[PDB]
């Protein structure tokens, strides 16, 4: 018998579970309260070689479209200015999420004892590396072929100037790798990807296409195809510890803490990037958020984990109350601090203001009037000597940074949440924006010592910080960041220096 014969992935994976053997020190090297069953199985029966093949095939299509048809169509250029800027943040911020996920799944791979569960996490380790490079490619492509390379070309260092980056690291960097492996698994997979990341990636391709961007859909839709393996990983994480008695005592709290951590940042940030970083709208963020968080995640997803003792996050009701105006409240701060970014922002045009009011009754009387006031005052013109941060100072509206989530908040102006808790402990002041974050710090002060921008930049003149952190374009004079998206009247380092803006730690006013 000489019939052509071979062997596939499933046939090898069949005996993968037996690859691991017993010996005294065969245990995780990371602190954890849980015990992952040493017989846990994985959903996809893959071996290294088949994994590569299925991913290589996707790369083919993706890079083929990018290098050929899309380039021939000048797809990198024919994108709305506002969206070109938005993608600088979306792609780079997600990049770090993808990157730390490599470390996270590495930690999870070390945590799992069953060979198959380790193999499941391993596949994501590789996927996360692919995603890091994909998000990197989007910025690389828009830098090479876009209308404004600045920011796209150096976000890895220019992002350190702004406050939005700090919070991104909390949810997509540190939140993914610092803590109980299982807690990280919850931030990354059970909450992060299942509730936000996945729905977000697809949504982004929708807003991208609406604004002329066919580059992002080509890359992000490819990333999306890898998500079923990660959902399984997250789901299997729970199944792996469901039996352990410690689970009943700890799972729900790590989850709740994980849910709050992630929503605290994405609730305001995502809505902002979608509604304010685009010209053409796809759907109101309030509607989107409700579907994602309450219907899809909080309901169907969390529901299926019920048999494993998983319960709806106790802070869910709170998240919904704080959500409504969250993104609108944050854009005011983001724009007021525009010189600290690595992207260009625009104020809502007339059609947009109408869209905002139609979808968020009351929007115009608060946010709309403020933007028109700032614009008439010349916030878009470099010879005006006006930056919106000045307006906040003039009207005594201090801006704080939550010590835990790193999210900026202005309780005196906010149409949304306006709670503020300030504490002093061993010679250091702390500001919190909600009761959940306050507890985290109170219970785990050593986990949260992140210095905020006001602390680091205290006493420093704005232009010096920008210059030092390389917030300049090629000519070494024009700022990367801008308060408008037009091609003329770009602000320069000198236009900022003349403002004589000096940072102050707002918390010291309580002394």
């Amino acid at each position: 018998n000489r019939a052509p014969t071979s062997v596939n992935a499933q046939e090898v994976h069949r005996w993968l579970q037996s690859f691991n053997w017993d010996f005294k020190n065969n245990r995780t090297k990371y602190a954890t309260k849980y015990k992952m069953a040493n017989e846990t199985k994985e959903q996809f029966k893959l071996i290294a070689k088949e994994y590569a093949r299925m991913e290589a095939v996707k790369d083919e299509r993706q890079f083929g479209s990018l290098q050929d048809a899309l380039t021939r169509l000048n797809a990198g250029v024919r994108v709305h200015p506002k969206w070109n800027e938005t993608m600088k943040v979306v792609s780079n911020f997600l990049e770090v999420g993808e990157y730390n996920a490599i470390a996270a799944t590495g930690m999870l791979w070390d945590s799992a004892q069953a060979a198959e569960q380790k193999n499941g996490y391993l596949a994501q380790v590789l996927d996360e590396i692919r995603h890091t490079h994909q998000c990197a490619y989007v910025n690389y492509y828009f830098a090479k072929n876009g209308q404004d390379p600045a920011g796209h070309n150096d976000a890895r260092r220019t992002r350190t100037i702004g406050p939005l980056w700090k919070g991104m690291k909390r949810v997509f960097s540190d939140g993914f790798i610092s803590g109980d492996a299982v807690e990280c698994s919850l931030n990354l997979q059970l909450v992060g990807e299942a509730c936000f990341t996945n729905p977000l990636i697809v949504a982004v391709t929708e807003w991208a296409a609406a604004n002329g961007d066919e580059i992002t859909p080509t890359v992000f839709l490819s990333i999306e195809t890898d998500e079923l393996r990660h959902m399984a990983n997250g789901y299997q994480t729970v199944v792996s510890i469901a039996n352990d008695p410690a689970s009943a005592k700890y799972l729900n709290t790590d989850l709740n803490n994980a849910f709050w951590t992630q929503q605290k940042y994405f609730t305001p940030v995502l809505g902002m990037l979608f509604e304010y970083g685009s010209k053409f709208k796809v759907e109101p963020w309030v509607k989107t958020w409700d579907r994602w968080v309450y219907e899809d995640w909080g309901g169907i997803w969390i529901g299926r984990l019920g048999k494993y003792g998983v319960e709806s996050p106790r802070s869910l009701k709170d998240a919904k109350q704080d959500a409504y105006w969250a993104h609108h409240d944050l854009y005011l701060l983001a724009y007021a601090l525009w010189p600290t970014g690595f992207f260009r922002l625009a104020l809502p045009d007339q059609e947009e203001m109408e869209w905002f009011e139609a979808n968020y009754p009351g929007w115009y009387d608060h946010y709309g009037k403020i933007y028109e006031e700032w614009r008439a005052r010349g916030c878009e013109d470099p010879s005006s000597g006006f930056i919106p941060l000045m307006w906040f100072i003039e009207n005594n509206h201090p801006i704080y940074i939550d010590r835990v989530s790193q999210v900026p908040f202005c309780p005196s102006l906010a149409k949304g949440a306006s709670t503020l808790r300030v504490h002093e402990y061993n010679g250091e002041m702390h500001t919190f924006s909600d009761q959940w974050g306050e507890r985290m710090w109170l219970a785990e002060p050593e986990r949260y010592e992140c210095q905020n921008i006001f602390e680091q930049y205290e006493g420093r003149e704005l232009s010096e910080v920008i210059a030092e952190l390389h917030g300049l374009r090629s000519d070494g004079k024009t700022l990367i960041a801008q308060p408008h998206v037009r091609g003329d009247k770009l602000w320069t380092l000198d236009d900022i220096k003349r403002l004589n803006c000096v940072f102050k730690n707002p918390v010291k006013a309580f002394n």
Partner: protein, 387 residues
Amino acid sequence: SMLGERRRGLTDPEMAAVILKALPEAPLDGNNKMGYFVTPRWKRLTEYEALTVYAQPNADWIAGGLDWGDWTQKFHGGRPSWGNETTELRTVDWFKHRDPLRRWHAPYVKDKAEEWRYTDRFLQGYSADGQIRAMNPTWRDEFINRYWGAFLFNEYGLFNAHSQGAREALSDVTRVSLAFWGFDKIDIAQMIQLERGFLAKIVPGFDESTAVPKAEWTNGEVYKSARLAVEGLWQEVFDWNESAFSVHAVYDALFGQFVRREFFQRLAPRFGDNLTPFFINQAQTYFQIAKQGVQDLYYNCLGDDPEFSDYNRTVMRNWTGKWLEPTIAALRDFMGLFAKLPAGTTDKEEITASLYRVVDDWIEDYASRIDFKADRDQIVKAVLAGL
């Protein structure tokens, strides 16, 4: 519908017009090179460097970092997400490393995918060609199944040794190389099982179960010192650099190379077995690929660090010494395998020449890089005593 309901800004007349109207006359910056601020290792910046270097958000307090401030969230106790405290080695910049092969995800899976599909084709031809007819039955049912198979647990163990490194690596370029080194190891282990699974299909009484090879690994005597050395490199080492260094620049470079290249790749051909060598060709290709990266990190970067050259070489000489013993021990327990070979398969003169090939390659490729003074004669002598 034929046109669909969704309107796209690139093709929709109305939307496209609005977009074109907002566009500037020319790019707002002529610098269209992402990663332009990265120091090129070669003539011009490569796609590999642009897409990888600085992806890791390290602050300046971690040699090379470009960010600032503490991490946002740390471990209960205060342990940082990534810190200098996770490895004895020090450097002026953790982002200096560069994979000689410049592998980011795409090139990496492209190459492994080509190998997978060609592997499949090879197997379909080998079986159709009846080449199994000329393979020594004992060599198959005994040395390939039991001893080669058992070696899959050695590679698998070395694979897992990279778990902590995947989590603790202090830079992107190093994390990627590490992840690829480990993934290649699990690949090899899965390839050893793949062969056994193939033999199971073309050889009526062959059993692919890992039971026999596993028992050999766990309770056997041939790989005893080997398994002990693996369990240690994997679960007793908490320094990600000591793990990678020792695994690749010591253990697998001595034991692993000898077993794959000097035992099976050298003897399989004598029993009419070109099947096993087909897979070892992959394992050796992978070994030589990883080696270039292992060398660039620990020697070109750390070992020759403009500020910690002496320091790092000391730590590595210490590690080399620390693991050279368990490895030599592993080689000795392995020598016992020759006694089970059919009479006349090989002689002491050959094995001695093979050991020196391994030891000499090791010295030239690793030991001499960190000024580690190893004695080829005493090592071979120490190992040869296992016969």
